[PDB]
Write a protein that binds this ligand. Structure first.
Ligand SMILES: NC(=O)C1=CN([C@@H]2O[C@H](COP(=O)(O)OP(=O)(O)OC[C@H]3O[C@@H](n4cnc5c(N)ncnc54)[C@H](OP(=O)(O)O)[C@@H]3O)[C@@H](O)[C@H]2O)C=CC1
Ligand SMILES: CN(Cc1cnc2nc(N)nc(N)c2n1)c1ccc(C(=O)N[C@@H](CCC(=O)O)C(=O)O)cc1
Length: 161
């Protein structure tokens, strides 16, 4: 099983503000969907609340230590190890956030699916400093701003070296 993390970063690795993402960029969610459909997705409790529903076409695994926390349509696990057990023998597990989960799983990640957005915005959550490790890019895509998406963004799939 490949352990992958997927995130969208504005400048200075900002990923979140006030439990939402501080930009309007609907097409980027389509990128997220293409990259995660058919795979188990593992997330922290705040990220689940931010999404607001189980996502279709994916096994939704949510981390919480709250013993009575049990949203419909997701599997709640109390440890990372248990998340990995729920994911089963699949090709690739996708960690979809948020900061605390990214922090705990970075050292173990085989791939990062990063979208970089050309935007300086204030944050209260940041992606980890992945650049402390070595990576090679194995896929990439560029997306210039258009009438529905006001910022340039690009995709980079990194593999740990
Ligand atoms: N730009 C992007 O790509 C993304 C941005 N985001 C943003 O990230 C932010 C959310 O990140 P953050 O606040 O760090 O929260 P998370 O989504 O990482 O949720 C953290 C919660 O998960 C639970 N938890 C964490 N680690 C463990 C563990 N090892 N075992 C069991 N439970 C655990 C705890 O919940 P409990 O207290 O219930 O135990 C904890 O408070 C939001 O602003 C969101 O919009 C999120 C995803 C993608
Ligand atoms: C807040 N959030 C988390 C989120 C958003 N963008 C990301 N973007 C990247 N690149 N990586 C992430 N981990 C990521 N996570 C959300 C919110 C909504 C939907 C959502 O409704 N997505 C639909 C597609 C969009 C839609 O249905 O309107 C899907 O099927 O994946 C997903 C993630």
């Amino acid at each position: 099983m490949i352990v992958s993390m997927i995130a969208a970063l504005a400048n200075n690795r900002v990923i979140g503000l006030d439990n939402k993402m501080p930009w309007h960029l609907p097409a980027e969610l389509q990128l997220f969907k293409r990259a995660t459909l058919g795979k188990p997705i593992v997330m922290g409790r705040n990220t689940f609340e931010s999404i607001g529903r189980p996502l279709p076409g994916r096994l939704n695994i949510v981390l919480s230590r709250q013993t009575d926390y049990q949203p419909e349509g997701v599997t709640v696990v109390a440890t990372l190890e248990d998340a990995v057990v729920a994911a089963g023998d699949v090709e690739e597990l996708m960690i979809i956030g948020g900061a605390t989960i990214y922090n705990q799983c970075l050292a173990a990640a085989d791939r990062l699916y990063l979208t970089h957005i050309e935007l300086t915005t204030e944050g209260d959550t940041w992606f980890p400093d992945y650049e402390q490790y070595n990576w090679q890019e194995i896929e990439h895509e560029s997306y210039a701003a258009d009438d529905k998406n006001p910022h340039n963004y690009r995709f980079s799939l990194l593999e740990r070296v």
